[PDB]
From a paper:
SidE family of effectors (SdeA, SdeB, SdeC and SidE) employ phosphoribosyl ubiquitination to target multiple host Rab GTPases and innate immune factors. Upon activation by host Calmodulin (CaM), SidJ executes an ATP-dependent glutamylation to modify the catalytic residue Glu860 in the mono-ADP-ribosyl transferase (mART) domain of SdeA. SidJ is a unique glutamylase that adopts a kinase-like fold but contains two nucleotide-binding pockets. Our structures reveal that both phosphodiesterase (PDE) and mART domains of SdeA make extensive contacts with SidJ.
Here, we trapped the pre-glutamylation reaction intermediate of the SidJ/CaM-SdeA complex for structural studies by introducing a single point mutation in SidJ. Our data indicates that the SidJ E565A-CaM-SdeA heterotrimeric complex is likely a reaction intermediate that occurs after ATP hydrolysis but before glutamylation by SidJ. The refined structure contains one molecule each of SdeA, SidJ, and CaM with the adenylylated E860 of SdeA pointing directly into the migrated pocket of SidJ. Intriguingly, the N-lobe of SidJ KD and the canonical pocket of SidJ, which is implicated in the catalysis, do not make any contact with SdeA. Glutamylation target residue E860 of SdeA is clearly seen adenylylated and inserted into the migrated pocket of SidJ. This indicates that the trapped SidJ/CaM-SdeA complex represents a state of catalysis after the adenylylation of SdeA and before the glutamylation. A key hydrogen-bonding network involving Q851 of SdeA, the backbone carbonyl of E860 of SdeA, and Y732, N733 of SidJ positions the glutamylation target residue SdeA E860 in the migrated pocket of SidJ. A Mg2+ ion and the side chain of SidJ R500 engage in tight coordination with the α-phosphate of the AMP, likely increasing the reactivity of the acyl-AMP intermediate towards the amino group of the incoming glutamate.
Author numbering:
A (entry chain B): 3 to 94, 97 to 129, 138 to 146
B (entry chain C): 100 to 848
C (entry chain A): 231 to 506, 510 to 590, 758 to 853, 858 to 904
Write the structure that this text describes.
């Protein structure tokens, strides 16, 4: 599996940000935007699928439990070797760049790590090799 | 399932059906006039542009400190990036060009710093002023130096109220972005200008300048809301067999009765002076919150109401006879041969107050979390509680004061010429019977709909007459037109926003006084100074976490991040020290020298608390001589980090909301370009997307991921466009996005 | 203007020098034992945080007394051009204070060895340059004009030569460090006189007395042992210039050279060597020779050397108290102590210049919109009356201060009616925004004021004719909304029975 807590905090901040009147329900007009803001930019038909499935009465509004269930059912087979390859390729370029730049960026970009965590991951490692050795 | 029955929106004004804006003095009816904010601000910005032109054509440019020329240049670049008209934008850039030339010549290191701020942001002045450079009003200095033609009276008033910083003249998106980034980790901004004589504090002017830029709020309650939907009356199909063989105690006017199921049946008898409407209102609210508890996701244990009816005063006074305070009770209840009683079934912890000293700090933390969560969840639902506790200021002229003696947590916003938070009169008797309990909230009867803050209700007309009637002072009186002009009268259009923020601040103030009462009652039995300091330190942690939970519930900002933003602005160490010092009588034993020497420590980098009244021994500061006050008579409250924490909380909530408004106002402008509805050059589209990048919440990444996706689509529309100016910031965004999607992969396993 | 106490820049430099150099244990095995005051460790007890902060305050006070001495028409020194310490600007003084924060940052012990001396001074220069290289952002634009500027200050820190008497920055940074080490050297009558004659060359007698009086009050403020001057001590006089002695030749008369045009000139300096008579000269006889009595006030005048009050019983445990270590380990605390001391040293010369002396408020502000020519003619009189009350150290000054105060009829605009004042400076600025603010101080309730009931914080004051208002300090606090200078005068109420 289920979604973590640092994902739930981000989902809740996004859902709260795109709920413009603050009644805990987002319209379908900004469901596409709140899903693009989360790195899930789907086709018009892919969004229409959930427009029909989620809204089975025509209410046109999603509650945060419904949004969480939808976003977890979407994230079943979306992250893969392609995602990891793009993630590693943005840093690199033949397949190995550096272990120093990695340790630098994993503590200054995003939800920063710690020395023990980074080193352990560095010890667990060759970008593609480390990405396919886990 | 889970959603709120209230929804926010914008209205035209709140200035409908208000007391007419007149001041009656000696038979003269002085009219009160508003000074328009966003028009005087623009007039002063245009006077600033004229002054910059005069500075350039006067060749005195070398006689300006090179950090003020850097400030002028970065402001001109930000201001030209905020303009949408080509002519004004190009005039501003023609003004900023000679300054850039002079800086590239004279100060090449300052120029190398500027050029790196500029390739990072569209408003590079907000990142230049995240430090003590904000306390220098370069715009107003330049206006005073070269615009020798006199300012009008409205511009003079704007200068007077916002004399401290130069950010009080930025347009709305730049000011909102600067205010939100002031709370960033890499910021050293503190709204305190310690000069040689005065040490001006202006943490309130930040929220004052933020609120005068907002649009009047309006909350619309749904049709099935408690204060809209009507339910049938209450039928006395249930009577409770009151038996003194089970009476536990008499709490106020409530008779508690034991239960074989370990619950407690409370019988709340009608007080002297209240009608049956109040008791049936509490019955209805309890039934409502029981019906809609899983929807609102309320944490409290709620009092399950059983009935509401009338009983013979004989039965009440015969059940109540076998007790201790039986006489006191007999004076509270009403005088009638039949009394209205409301009977509910609550758990035992419902009747233990929150400041009760028989609960360990773990249980106190859990209970304060429950109470804060439910208070703000019900504020999101449209229900406010104006009487959590009877906090008062200056009981002396209570009935004849504009505030009716009631304590205003944001007194500087809701009044003219009021600069600090005032004394709390008997701060402990004020929370003695607070409505916060070990189980959650209590006394849900004296609630109110949130819409009573945005309208001229009886609550609003009673306690906030100064705000609703406009401000007067002999110095506002324009002796020519015979009307008192003020920036404060404009708040008549917006008085609901001020009252919303004041409700949040007073919730937090009640939480703080409850925690302080707990600490003062639990450390009196201890002489081990380390343990007393540990108690007060954990209470400061509880207070800061409660304010962070308020921010999280209102705005959506994660609680950890809101806590970090708070701790940037208010010092938790000085808060723990000042609460321990002033919320205990131990400072009454110290003489003058030790008192001053300990204030040197608890204030730590700012002036001390000066009071000229005599300390009653064993008590502390007191005007009556038996109960302790928080502050001297006619002076401010000595809890300064509490005031800063309250203003940081309300400024964070309101500034986050306003920045989300600016962000979506710019995002729809961006999307009108990537669909052909506005055909412009590539520079216009890239400037739009980059401004959209400059309006995202500090340290919020999904907003930057959204802006990055828009930038990719903009590149897909203008293929051969030169992006040498914007590739850097979006490269950083792509890098941090890759870092995030890596961390989440490894951290999972 | 600029003040050491409220700057957050010199305070940041001092916090850096403490967390990196002045709060680190000594490693030189020479007086490197860290003391333990109360329960707190103090590593550098002779050249620590307290010492550097007192040296900064000495620089500030020296330039203030120089400015004050220029007003009453003194003849000061010359720094190779028409200039003196009276002409140091606040930016130059801020640079000097940033330099003084590291002057003893690179030490490892209290060794006076020349090689150790130069090593420590160049390490201090390196620490200063490293701090500037670290925080170059807010140092070169405003504080330090050029990089040659930082190099000049780092070269005056390293002190390769001994050209202390070259430029105002040299004189300040070196006197402030040498005049502080006057409570530790054992013979006070010689070190005090040497520093007195070395500083009065630049400023003057009446101002050096003030510098040393406020120095003793700083010592009291920061819990330091205060020496006691005594012009009848029999300890052998040591010449602080170098380290030598004075021997009298065979009857009672000191051995003196035979230079040109005069057989009565510079005393002959003798290193410690044999005697026999060839006996040394004590500080008593040294302080009463004709060439030193007519230039040093302390000749024939004594000091108690301690608190006026508390005896040695609790004096020792107040010096060895816990707040001394806190003053040695908190920049905020030591700065607050020095600030209080300087404020009281600014006020008390007035109280001692006169004879002995709901709740009433202490500080009352009263705005006024006056002319510009009149404001200049007012600031002139106020500064001319402020620059006649120096904190005398040896000689109690005169009733001349009283007569000048009574002859200066500036106090007529400050009272003679029922003035409408307030206890908020923001209220004076955000209602009338006057250009001439009078701040009247009521230290002990001598100002009969009553609240009038934001007109709740407002008061009405009536000045009794037996109480006078004397100016403490003129100021300048920006510009009013009408675009004009705003001068914040400051007065103090004193019971003056002689003003009938
Ligand atoms: Ca909605
Ligand atoms: Mg009052």
């Amino acid at each position: 599996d289920q979604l973590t807590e640092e994902q739930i905090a981000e989902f809740k901040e996004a859902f709260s940000l795109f709920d413009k009147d603050g009644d805990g329900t987002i319209t379908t007009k900004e469901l596409g935007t709140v899903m693009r803001s989360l790195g899930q930019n789907p086709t018009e038909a892919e969004l229409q699928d959930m427009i029909n499935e989620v809204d089975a009465d025509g209410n046109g509004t999603i509650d945060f439990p419904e949004f969480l269930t939808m976003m977890a059912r979407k994230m079943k087979d979306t992250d893969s070797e392609e995602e990891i390859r793009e993630a590693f390729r943005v840093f690199d370029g033949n397949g190995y760049i550096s272990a120093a730049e990695l340790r630098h960026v994993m503590t200054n970009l995003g939800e920063k790590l710690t020395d023990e965590e980074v080193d352990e991951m560095i010890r667990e490692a060759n970008y593609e090799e480390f990405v396919q050795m886990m | 399932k889970q959603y709120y029955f209230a929804r926010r929106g914008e209205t035209s004004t709140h200035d409908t059906s208000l007391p007419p804006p007149v001041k009656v003095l000696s038979g003269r009816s002085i009219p009160l006039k508003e000074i328009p904010f966003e028009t005087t601000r623009n007039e002063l910005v245009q006077i600033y542009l004229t002054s910059v032109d005069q500075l350039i054509k006067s060749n005195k440019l070398n006689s300006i400190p090179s950090q003020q020329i850097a400030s002028h240049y970065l402001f001109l670049r930000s201001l030209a990036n905020s303009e949408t008209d080509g002519i004004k934008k190009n005039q501003i850039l023609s003004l900023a060009k000679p300054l850039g030339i002079y800086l590239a010549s004279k100060e090449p290191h300052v120029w190398k710093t500027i050029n790196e701020l500029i390739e990072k942001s569209e408003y590079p002045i907000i990142h230049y002023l995240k430090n003590n450079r904000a306390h220098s009003n370069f715009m107003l200095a330049l206006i005073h130096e070269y615009h020798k033609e006199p300012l009008t009276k409205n511009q003079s008033a704007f200068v007077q109220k916002f004399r401290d910083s130069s950010v009080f003249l930025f347009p709305n998106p730049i000011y909102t972005a600067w205010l939100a980034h002031s709370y960033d980790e890499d910021s050293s901004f503190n709204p305190m200008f310690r000069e040689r004589l005065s040490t001006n504090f202006y943490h309130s002017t930040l929220t004052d300048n933020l609120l005068l830029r907002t649009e009047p709020k309006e909350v619309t309650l749904s049709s099935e809301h408690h204060y809209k939907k009507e339910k049938g009356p209450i039928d006395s199909s249930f009577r409770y067999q009151m038996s003194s063989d089970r009476l536990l105690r008499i709490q106020g006017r409530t008779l508690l009765f034991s239960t074989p199921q370990n619950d407690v049946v409370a019988v709340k008898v009608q007080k002297r002076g209240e009608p049956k409407s109040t008791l049936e209102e509490e019955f209805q609210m309890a039934d409502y919150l029981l019906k809609h508890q899983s929807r609102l996701d309320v944490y409290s244990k709620l009092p399950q109401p059983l009935g509401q009816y009338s009983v013979k005063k004989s039965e009440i006074l015969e059940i109540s006879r076998g007790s201790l305070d039986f006489e006191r009770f007999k004076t509270l209840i009403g005088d009638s041969k039949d009394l209205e009683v409301y009977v509910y079934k609550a758990p035992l912890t419902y009747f233990t107050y929150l400041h009760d000293k028989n609960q360990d700090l773990e249980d106190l933390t859990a209970s304060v979390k429950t109470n804060v969560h439910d208070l703000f969840v019900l504020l999101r639902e449209g229900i406010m509680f104006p009487q959590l506790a009877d906090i008062f200021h200056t009981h002396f002229g209570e009935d004849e004061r504009e505030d009716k003696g009631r304590y205003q947590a944001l007194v500087q916003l809701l009044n003219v010429l009021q600069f600090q938070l005032g004394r709390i009169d008997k701060w402990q008797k004020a929370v003695e019977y607070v409505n916060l309990r070990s189980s959650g909230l209590a006394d849900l009867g004296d609630s109110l709909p949130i819409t009573s803050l945005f309208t001229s209700s009886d609550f609003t007309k009673h306690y906030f007459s100064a705000l609703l009637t406009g401000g007067y002072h002999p110095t506002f009186f324009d002796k020519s037109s015979g009307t008192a002009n003020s920036l404060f009268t404009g708040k008549r259009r917006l008085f609901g926003n001020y009252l919303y923020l004041n409700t949040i601040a007073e919730y937090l103030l009640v939480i703080q006084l409850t925690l302080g009462s707990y600490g003062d009652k639990v450390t009196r039995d201890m002489m081990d100074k380390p343990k007393k300091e540990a108690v007060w330190r954990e209470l400061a942690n509880v207070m800061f976490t409660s304010c962070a939970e308020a921010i999280h519930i209102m705005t959506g900002i994660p609680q950890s991040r809101a806590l970090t933003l708070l701790k940037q602005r208010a010092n938790i160490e000085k808060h723990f020290r000042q609460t321990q010092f002033w919320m205990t009588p131990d400072y009454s034993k110290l003489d003058e020298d030790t008192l001053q020497m300990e204030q040197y420590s608890i204030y730590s980098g700012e002036p001390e608390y000066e009071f000229t009244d005599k300390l009653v021994s064993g008590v502390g500061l007191s005007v009556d001589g038996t109960h302790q006050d928080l502050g001297g008579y006619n002076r401010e409250s000595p809890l300064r980090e509490l005031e800063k924490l309250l203003y940081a909380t309300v400024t964070l909530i309101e500034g986050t909301m306003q920045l989300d408004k600016e962000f979506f106002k710019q995002l729809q402008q961006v999307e009108k370009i990537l669909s052909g509805e506005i055909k412009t050059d590539a520079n216009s589209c890239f400037e739009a997307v980059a401004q959209l990048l400059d309006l995202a919440r500090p340290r919020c990444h999904f907003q930057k991921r959204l802006v990055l996706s828009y930038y990719e689509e903009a590149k897909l529309k203008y293929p051969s466009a030169p992006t040498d100016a914007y590739d850097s910031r979006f490269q950083v965004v792509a890098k941090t996005n890759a870092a995030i999607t890596i961390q989440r992969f490894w951290r999972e396993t | 203007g600029f003040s050491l106490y409220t700057d957050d820049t010199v305070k940041a430099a001092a916090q850096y020098a403490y967390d990196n150099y002045l709060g680190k244990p000594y490693t030189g095995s020479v007086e490197s034992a860290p003391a333990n005051f109360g329960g707190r460790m103090v590593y550098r007890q002779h050249h620590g945080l307290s010492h550097t902060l007192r040296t900064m305050a000495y620089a500030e006070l020296i330039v203030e007394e120089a400015r004050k001495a220029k007003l009453r028409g003194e003849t000061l020194g010359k720094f190779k051009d028409g200039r003196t310490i009276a002409d140091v600007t606040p930016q130059e003084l801020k640079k000097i204070m940033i330099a003084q924060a590291f002057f003893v940052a690179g030490r490892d012990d209290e060794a006076s060895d020349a090689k150790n001396y130069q090593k420590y001074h160049e390490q201090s220069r390196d620490a200063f340059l490293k701090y500037v290289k670290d925080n170059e952002s807010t140092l070169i634009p405003d504080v330090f004009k050029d990089q040659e500027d930082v190099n000049f200050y780092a070269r005056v820190i390293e002190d390769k030569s001994h050209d202390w008497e070259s430029t105002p920055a040299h004189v300040l940074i070196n006197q402030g460090h040498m005049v502080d080490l006057v409570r530790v050297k054992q013979p006070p009558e010689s070190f005090l006189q040497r520093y007195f004659s070395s500083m009065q060359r630049w400023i003057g007698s009446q101002a050096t007395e003030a510098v040393f009086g406020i120095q003793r009050q700083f010592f009291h403020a920061t819990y330091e042992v205060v020496a006691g001057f005594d012009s009848d001590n029999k300890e052998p006089h040591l010449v602080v210039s170098g380290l030598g002695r004075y021997v009298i030749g065979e009857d009672g008369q000191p051995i003196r050279e035979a230079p040109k045009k005069g057989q009565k000139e510079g005393d002959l300096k003798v290193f410690p060597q044999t005697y026999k008579n060839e006996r040394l000269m004590r500080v008593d006889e040294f302080l009463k020779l004709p060439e030193i009595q007519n230039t040093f006030p302390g000749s024939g005048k004594h000091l108690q050397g301690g608190m006026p009050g508390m005896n040695e019983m609790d004096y020792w445990n107040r010096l060895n108290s816990l707040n001394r270590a806190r003053c040695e380990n908190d920049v905020d605390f030591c700065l607050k102590q020095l600030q209080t001391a300087h404020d009281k040293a600014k006020i008390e010369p007035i109280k001692q210049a006169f004879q002995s002396s709901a709740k009433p408020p202490t500080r009352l502000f009263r705005g006024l919109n006056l002319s510009e020519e009149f404001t200049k003619g007012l600031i002139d009189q106020a500064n001319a009356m402020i620059a006649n009350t120096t904190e005398r150290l040896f000689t109690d000054h005169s009733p001349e201060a009283f007569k000048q105060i009574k002859l200066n009829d500036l106090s007529k605009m400050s009272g003679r009616t029922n003035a409408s004042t307030t206890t908020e400076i923001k209220l004076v600025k955000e209602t009338w925004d006057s250009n001439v603010i009078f701040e009247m101080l009521d230290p002990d309730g001598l100002l009969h004021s009553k609240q009038v009931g934001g007109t709740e914080s407002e008061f009405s004051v009536y000045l009794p004719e037996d109480v006078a208002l004397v100016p403490v300090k003129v100021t300048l606090d920006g510009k009013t909304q009408k675009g004009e200078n705003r001068y914040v005068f400051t007065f103090v109420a004193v019971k003056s029975p002689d003003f009938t």
